[PDB]
Design a protein around this ligand. Sequence first.
Ligand SMILES: CC(C)S[C@@H]1O[C@H](CO)[C@H](O)[C@H](O)[C@H]1O
Ligand SMILES: CC(C)S[C@@H]1O[C@H](CO)[C@H](O)[C@H](O)[C@H]1O
Ligand SMILES: CC(C)S[C@@H]1O[C@H](CO)[C@H](O)[C@H](O)[C@H]1O
Ligand SMILES: CC(C)S[C@@H]1O[C@H](CO)[C@H](O)[C@H](O)[C@H]1O
Ligand SMILES: [Mg+2]
Ligand code: NA
Ligand code: NA
Ligand code: NA
Ligand code: NA
Ligand code: NA
Ligand code: NA
Lengths: 204, 409
Amino acid sequence: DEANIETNGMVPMNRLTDDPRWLPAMSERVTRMVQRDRNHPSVIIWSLGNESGHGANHDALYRWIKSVDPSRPVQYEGGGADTTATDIICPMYARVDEDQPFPAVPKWSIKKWLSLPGETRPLILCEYAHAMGNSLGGFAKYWQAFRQYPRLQGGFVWDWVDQSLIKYDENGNPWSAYGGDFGDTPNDRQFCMNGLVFADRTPH
Amino acid sequence: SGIFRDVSLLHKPTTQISDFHVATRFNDDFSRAVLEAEVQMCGELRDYLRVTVSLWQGETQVASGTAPFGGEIIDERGGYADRVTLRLNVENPKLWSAEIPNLYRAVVELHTADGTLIEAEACDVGFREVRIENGLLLLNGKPLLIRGVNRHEHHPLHGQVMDEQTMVQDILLMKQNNFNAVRCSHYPNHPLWYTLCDRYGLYVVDEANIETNGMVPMNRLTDDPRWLPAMSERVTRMVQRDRNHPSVIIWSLGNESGHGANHDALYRWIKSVDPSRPVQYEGGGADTTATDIICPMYARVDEDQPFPAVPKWSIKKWLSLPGETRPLILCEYAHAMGNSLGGFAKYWQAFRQYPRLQGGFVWDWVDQSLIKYDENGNPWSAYGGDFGDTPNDRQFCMNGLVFADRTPH
Ligand SMILES: CC(C)S[C@@H]1O[C@H](CO)[C@H](O)[C@H](O)[C@H]1O
Ligand SMILES: CC(C)S[C@@H]1O[C@H](CO)[C@H](O)[C@H](O)[C@H]1O
Ligand SMILES: CC(C)S[C@@H]1O[C@H](CO)[C@H](O)[C@H](O)[C@H]1O
Ligand SMILES: CC(C)S[C@@H]1O[C@H](CO)[C@H](O)[C@H](O)[C@H]1O
Ligand SMILES: [Mg+2]
Ligand code: NA
Ligand code: NA
Ligand code: NA
Ligand code: NA
Ligand code: NA
Ligand code: NA
């Protein structure tokens, strides 16, 4: 269960989340979600949000949940996926064998990540296997790694269903549309479609 | 068998230096150190005796200290009236490493207060710290990448007798081929070996002469207290002899003798007597309580070999097993028997990518073939069985990177 907090577009990504002036609004997005959903057995982990860098606010909120509901681990990928705000190493798109040593927020090979000096947590990717169009190449490589390594505990594929929207043609026939198709601009064109299934649930 | 090491006669005064131990500790960034030399004597104690320990960098004496015997208070009964510890400060010491084997000379003099020498002992001193921190083996604070090899003491004509020339030849070839470390498989070596390592610069794993491979199960003797005494002397006498060599950076409890309680006891003894060097031991699955380093033999890079009780996990996988935090350095890998070393690069690529994979010791340096002569006196290399020995293990004695005469494979 994930809080409704995403500040992907700020520069740097944690501009708002490291700002105490934004702590109050953030705080409610986390607290009110916990108050609402805490009794559902299906919810096994709480998440602080998504792509909002790593700021102090995340740290305060992580601690709040640990206090109020010790029954579920808290995870958060921002700022490098292994910050002090997460109980689980939960990278997005880290590869199996190949390291991607980006500065500040490297995405190490998942096998290598587990064993960096002092690292002890389990690794579960918050997103992997971007199923955009004709994709899923290399899916097997992950599964093999997950089965071999106790601490590699799986992941969440990105994602379930294409976010395409129906439009109608001149003769009123329906067709699947993506970004830019509504005159919207700027837009990110087909990036909205990354699912294992078509919008109508027919599988890819 | 036989008397295969040197024989000598040593004359000592009745009042003599019976032991001395040298240690070097440092500040955080190694720009300061303190050398501590504990000296013990035998013979009659006299208030006029003194010990002076002086440290030299080449021709220059950089530090010196003198004191009468009488160590500090140890317990309710007092201290050692027969020992003394001198402490010398050293600013910006030149550090020892296999890259730059800088050495100083420590001279221990037993003499009278008025200046008359009774006797002098001495050793080469390498200022270096060995420690494992945060899961990594550090030397002078930097993480090592062990380019090692296991080396037996073997000569094709002379058997197990070692000579200076052969040892230097081996060292030069090792360095020339990019090795920086050597494991004493699987016994203390001829004394000169250490001197050469100290001076030419190689990291050394000094290993107790204990291997009970053929027992069933392997730890049958090592888990038996009745064998604790004998094993104990193979460990303790090694430390007492070699503890002052800076090239020795890790002590080893022996090899292929399973994991038994005697090993835990001896692991602890070393930890207690010489905290300056990690202790490793592979028996019993390579990650027991008697080892500071996960030190498997022949574990593969990616492939697991889940043998019961003593699995050999893929090294990459091993490091991250739940709760595992130690560095991993294979005590033996890349078995070079015959036309071999296939897959070598695979290990190097892993070592470079994983911080806690800190290398390994190839098995092994030199083919243990022996020379035989045909009817015309022409020599040929022989292996197991060629002397009428039986049973025997045939060519398994030949696993080196180099042929017995030092020609490379
Ligand atoms: C993109 C590569 C250089 S990453 C490279 O792949 C290898 C396979 O060839 C190994 O498995 C290594 O772990 C990995 O670093
Ligand atoms: C395209 C990258 C620069 S951002 C990348 O975009 C994806 C688009 O489907 C997802 O939204 C990922 O979560 C996001 O990290
Ligand atoms: C080689 C020494 C100067 S290190 C010196 O030791 C001190 C204790 O004697 C303290 O630990 C200092 O912090 C340390 O730098
Ligand atoms: C042959 C194996 C069952 S034991 C194997 O034999 C090798 C022969 O070179 C080495 O002696 C290894 O240390 C030993 O484990
Ligand atoms: Mg000489
Ligand atoms: Na797993
Ligand atoms: Na666009
Ligand atoms: Na998308
Ligand atoms: Na490494
Ligand atoms: Na045989
Ligand atoms: Na052999």
